[PDB]
Amino acid sequence: DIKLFGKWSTDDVQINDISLQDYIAVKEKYAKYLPHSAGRYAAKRFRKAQCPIVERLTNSMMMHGRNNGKKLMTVRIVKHAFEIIHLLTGENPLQVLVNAIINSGPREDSTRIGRAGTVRRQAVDVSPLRRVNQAIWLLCTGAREAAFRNIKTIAECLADELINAAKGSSNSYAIKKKDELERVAKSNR
Amino acid sequence: PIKLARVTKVLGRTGSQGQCTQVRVEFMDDTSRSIIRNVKGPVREGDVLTLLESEREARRL
Amino acid sequence: EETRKIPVPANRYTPLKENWMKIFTPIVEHLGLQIRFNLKSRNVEIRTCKETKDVSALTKAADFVKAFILGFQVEDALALIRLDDLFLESFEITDVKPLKGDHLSRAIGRIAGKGGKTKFTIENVTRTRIVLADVKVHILGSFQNIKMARTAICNLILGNPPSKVYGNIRAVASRSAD
Amino acid sequence: VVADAGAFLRHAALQDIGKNIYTIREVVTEIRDKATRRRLAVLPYELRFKEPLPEYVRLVTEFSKKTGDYPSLSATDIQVLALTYQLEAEFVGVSHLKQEPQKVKVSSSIQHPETPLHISGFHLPGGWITPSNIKQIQQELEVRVGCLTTDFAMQNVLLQMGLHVLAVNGMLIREARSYILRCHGCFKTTSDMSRVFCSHCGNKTLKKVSVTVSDDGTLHMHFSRNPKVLNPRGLRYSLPTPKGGKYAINPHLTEDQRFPQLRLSQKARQKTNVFAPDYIAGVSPFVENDISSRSATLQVRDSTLGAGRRRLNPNASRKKFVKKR
Amino acid sequence: LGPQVAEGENVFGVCHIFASFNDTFVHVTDLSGKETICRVTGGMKVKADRDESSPYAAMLAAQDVAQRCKELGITALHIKLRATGGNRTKTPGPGAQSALRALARSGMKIGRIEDVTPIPSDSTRRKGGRRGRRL
Ligand SMILES: [Zn+2]
């Protein structure tokens, strides 16, 4: 049977929302042994929705300038972080990741509608794909920022951010940013 | 409360810089109440959304 | 059952006859109303029936035929049966400035413009339909659009050249969050 | 059951009533409506195409040139008439139908030809348009093989010969009343209500005269004994010298005269549709007017527009600050 | 509280809708016109002088007078539409149209629409100058 990293089951995870059920591809058809697939998911529009979510997390972690080519190191980081997730919670770490992503994505956002000079932003809904993209980017950026100058390793802060985002506590940077954008949009309407 | 939405058909790209998308909205609450809405990001016909306020109507006329 | 009667003048009989099917079809299909044309009294008679969907459909039909009889396009008054914030305010030309004779005639001219161009340009800015009957001006649109249209038209018939009116009306449209 | 193109245009789904559903390929291949062609590919295919033996095509032609309907009909209409004649011949005995059609009788009255009798919404002294009447109002409505002909010339020649003609309604038609145009110079009648110049003499002289045909084979034709109709008031006026070039509008004196092309822009000849489901997201309640094209500057108009202006006679006084293009 | 009439016959009032060029009045009264049932001008709803004349305030006033009529039992209304008249404009604005529309929407049977506007036979002098008026 297909397992992530040789050990992680993928038939046990569940998607809570129907909104993101077609955009997080982890369940049955799209599970793989390693995140590193090197496939063309930026070839055409919406193709990256079929990319597995763990590879998306790996790709958005090597995003920053010095680590801009290193993916093997990043998939090592993801492997160690998922190991720490399984050690702490005991749940399947993929479900923890999915809960973090569905809990971290903003539901509406403010937009400049008008011209350059009209600073009244209108609150508009967000695409579910944009919601997933923003959730991925905020989780990676919070893990990046929390582990810049400290003894805590990147994978450790990454796992801790995933725990706070899936649990929903106000310790994750991502959920703080989500609340900020959402309340700014609710102020605009 | 939270009312989830469906995309019937995409009207077009609106906004100052074409960063908003005007779409037609179907509800999964067994109602045929289809309303126009504007969204941010990439959407297609068949997307399923999460609308926090269903009372809001888009820029109509 | 309650009814309304809408008179027709003699220059609106032939447009009422050629455009008749386009009148009575949306009234009886989408509003479910009885309609006829009393030739002896020369009235369009609109009557409620069993099949009417809701109240204030018959008022929509009355506004539809009134806007047609004043001279609007049938499509522009199908806009009345559809939309809710569309009204019609009218005035005589000599309600703004006392004009007599050729002066009054020139007033009509500089509302219309060459080819009608001025009229059409005003309609393009305020998103209204204007109709100029013999000495009388009728506007159709939203409330703020009708007051923009009156501002432009009243500047035209108190003397100002159309270029000034074009600039003023585009600026007023820009400041009005259009 | 011979289906004319009028049945396919009207979407008369009457294939369940009859079983002898036959038609020409030419009448169905000439239709330019997209919805009808879409409906053609969905319908159950029990209709069969044929072509009549040309001998009855002649015979139909020699009595149509006698009944006064020959210029009005098309070749395909002669094909439909010949097909229903042959199906009548093959199925039913041929002694039923008669030839050398009966002479018209004349009976005049006082009513103006423009009196709006037989228009549905109108009422002289109740006649209402109800939601129950819209499916009912098609025309004047009253065994094995019939016709689905809606053009009046078709029904005229059919009821002259004696073929039972039926409608979109299942029951066959007994009486058919309509209007024709007759020339007061050469006295030749046309069944085409659109046409304004005479076919024979070519003058702008056709005037409206009502006709009614019975199922028996009698045609009777009602004139109007009103001196308003034949009065030459604005018929003599002096004409400008003929002008050429791309922008000349000559006063249109002969039917087949050549005009320069002055067409409206596609933006200008677009009307606003409010029944569209994408209308309410539209910015304006109405379509924007065209003020940017060359035809806006040239003041090109739709051909139908400005009709009551033409019926004012040219030797008359318009207002002193108006100009008639 | 009201008339003691069966459910069939309607007790009519007369609705004077007067659409001025600064606000709109709604005066429901007796068929005689002498004693008044209700009158809600546009400025009783919107707390801004700019929107005294809007169709929104006209709608709100129409709901108010309709509610007060069902309080006292009036079920059907004749309507007399009116603009300022005299020297001034003769055709009623969108305020009277909106009041009529919303009042017809709110369960009222509508009788006859009559334009009682003061058209003079021959007028006094206009409030404007020779030089013109309205901007
Ligand atoms: Zn002739």
Which residues have CB under 8 Å from A90's CB, separation 6+?
none
- Show binding-site residues of D: 183, 186, 198, 201
- Among C34, C51, C82, the domain boundary falls at C82
Cα–Cα distance for residue pair D47/D279, rounded to 1 Å: 40
Partner A contacted by B15 (CB < 8 A): yes
Q: What type of residue sits at position D274?
A: V
3-state class of B4 per DSSP?
strand
3-state class of D201 per DSSP?
coil
Judging by beta carbons within 10 Å of its beta carbon (0-12, 13-18, 19+), is residue C92 exposed, middle or buried?
A: middle
- Among C60, C82, C104, the domain boundary falls at C82
Reading across the β-sheet that carries D122-123, which strands appear in turn? C3-7, C43-47, C34-38, D122-123
Residues of chain E contacting C56 with CB distance shorter than 8 Å = 101, 104-105
Partner-chain residue, chosen from B43, B48, B52, that has the shortest CB–CB distance to A18: B48
3-state class of A182 per DSSP?
helix
Q: Find the D132 Cα to ligand 1 centroid distance in Å.
A: 43
Cα–Cα distance for residue pair C135/C131, rounded to 1 Å: 11
- Partner chains of A (3+ C-beta pairs under 8 Å): B
Partner D contacted by C32 (CB < 8 A): yes
Pairing of strands B20-27, B35-40: antiparallel
Partner E contacted by C56 (CB < 8 A): yes
Q: What kind of experiment solved this structure?
A: cryo-EM
Residues of chain A contacting B14 with CB distance shorter than 8 Å = 113
Residues of chain C contacting D272 with CB distance shorter than 8 Å = 73, 75-76, 78-79
Asked if A111's CB is within 8 angstroms of B20's CB, the reply is: yes
Q: Which stretch of DSSP H or E encloses residue C163?
A: helix C162-175
CB burial of E94-132 (b: ≥16 within 10 Å; e: otherwise) equals bbbbbbbbbbbbbebebbebeeebeeeeeeeebebeeeb
Q: In this structure, what token pair is assigned to residue D15?
A: 């294939």
- Alpha helical stretches, state H, C38-161: 58-70, 74-82, 102-112, 117-126, 143-156
Q: Find the D55 Cα to ligand 1 centroid distance in Å.
A: 32
Query: What are the beta bridge partners of residue E82?
Result: E18
Q: For D119, which residue in chain C has the nearest alpha carbon?
A: C17
Partner-chain residue, chosen from D123, D285, D299, that has the shortest CB–CB distance to C86: D285
Partner C contacted by D247 (CB < 8 A): no
Q: In this structure, what token pair is assigned to residue A4?
A: 């992530």
Resolution of the entry in angstroms: 3.1
| C109 and C166 part of one domain | yes
| C78 and C100 part of one domain | no
Asked if C143's CB is within 8 angstroms of E100's CB, the reply is: no
CA distances from D22 to B9, D3, D4, D152 (A): 42, 7, 9, 21
Sequence spans of domains, chain A? 4-187
Question: What single string gives the DSSP state of each residue in A124-169?
Answer: EEE-HHHHHHHHHHHHHHHHHHHTSSSSS-HHHHHHHHHHHHHHT-
Do D91 and D144 meet the contact criterion of CB atoms below 8 Å apart? yes
CA distances from C125 to B44, C26, D139, D284, D299 (A): 33, 29, 45, 10, 21
Q: For D279, which residue in chain B has the nearest alpha carbon?
A: B61
Question: Which is it for the CA torsion D141, D145, D151, D153, positive or negative?
Answer: negative
3-state class of C16 per DSSP?
helix
* Residue-number span of the structural domain to which C26 is assigned: 1-82
Partner-chain residue, chosen from A46, A116, A124, that has the shortest CB–CB distance to B40: A124
Residues of chain A contacting B16 with CB distance shorter than 8 Å = 112-116, 118
| C74 and C106 part of one domain | no
Asked if A124's CB is within 8 angstroms of B20's CB, the reply is: yes
User: Computed over its alpha carbons, how large is the radius of gyration of chain D?
Assistant: 24
Q: What type of residue sits at position A131?
A: R
Q: Could you give the count of Cα atoms lying within 13 Å of A61 in the half-sphere of its Cβ?
A: 26
Do A166 and A92 meet the contact criterion of CB atoms below 8 Å apart? no
Asked if B22's CB is within 8 angstroms of D278's CB, the reply is: no
Cα–Cα distance for residue pair D224/D231, rounded to 1 Å: 13
Q: What type of residue sits at position D63?
A: F
Neighbours of A120 (CB within 10 A): 10
Cα–Cα distance for residue pair E20/C120, rounded to 1 Å: 29
Q: Whose CA is closest to A81, among A162, A174, A6?
A: A162
Cα–Cα distance for residue pair D220/C171, rounded to 1 Å: 68
Asked if C95's CB is within 8 angstroms of E88's CB, the reply is: yes
Residue from C18, C37, C42, C84 to probe the interface with D (highest D Cβ count within 10 Å) = C37
Residue from B8, B32, B60 to probe the interface with D (highest D Cβ count within 10 Å) = B60
Asked if C90's CB is within 8 angstroms of E113's CB, the reply is: no
| C71 and C120 part of one domain | no
> DSSP character for D6?
H
Query: What are the beta bridge partners of residue D181?
Result: D190, D208
| C114 and C178 part of one domain | yes
Question: Which is it for the CA torsion C152, C157, C162, C164, positive or negative?
Answer: negative
Q: Find the D209 Cα to ligand 1 centroid distance in Å.
A: 14
Angle between helices C143-156 and C117-126 (to 10 degrees): 150
Q: Find the D197 Cα to ligand 1 centroid distance in Å.
A: 8
Judging by beta carbons within 10 Å of its beta carbon (0-12, 13-18, 19+), is residue D91 exposed, middle or buried?
A: exposed
Q: Cα–chain-centroid distance for residue D51?
A: 26
Q: Whose CA is closest to A32, among A57, A54, A47?
A: A54
Cα–Cα distance for residue pair C26/C59, rounded to 1 Å: 14
3-state class of C131 per DSSP?
strand
Closest-CA distance of chain B to residue A16, Å: 13
SS3 content of chain E, % helix, strand, coil (to 5): 25, 25, 50
What superfamily in CATH does domain E1-135 come from? Ribosomal protein S11/S14 (3.30.420.80)
Number of H helices and E strands in chain A, helices first, is 6, 2
Closest-CA distance of chain B to residue A176, Å: 19
Neighbours of A128 (CB within 10 A): 26
Query: What are the beta bridge partners of residue E24?
Result: E19
Cα–Cα distance for residue pair A187/A86, rounded to 1 Å: 39
User: Computed over its alpha carbons, how large is the radius of gyration of chain E?
Assistant: 16
- Among C57, C82, C107, the domain boundary falls at C82
Cα–Cα distance for residue pair C120/C124, rounded to 1 Å: 6
CATH number of A4-187: 1.10.455.10
CA distances from B41 to D40, E7, E84 (A): 42, 59, 54
Partner-chain residue, chosen from D281, D284, D285, that has the shortest CB–CB distance to B11: D281
Q: Are 3 or more Cβ–Cβ pairs between E and C shorter than 8 Å?
A: yes
Cα–Cα distance for residue pair D78/D101, rounded to 1 Å: 17
Q: Find the D177 Cα to ligand 1 centroid distance in Å.
A: 23
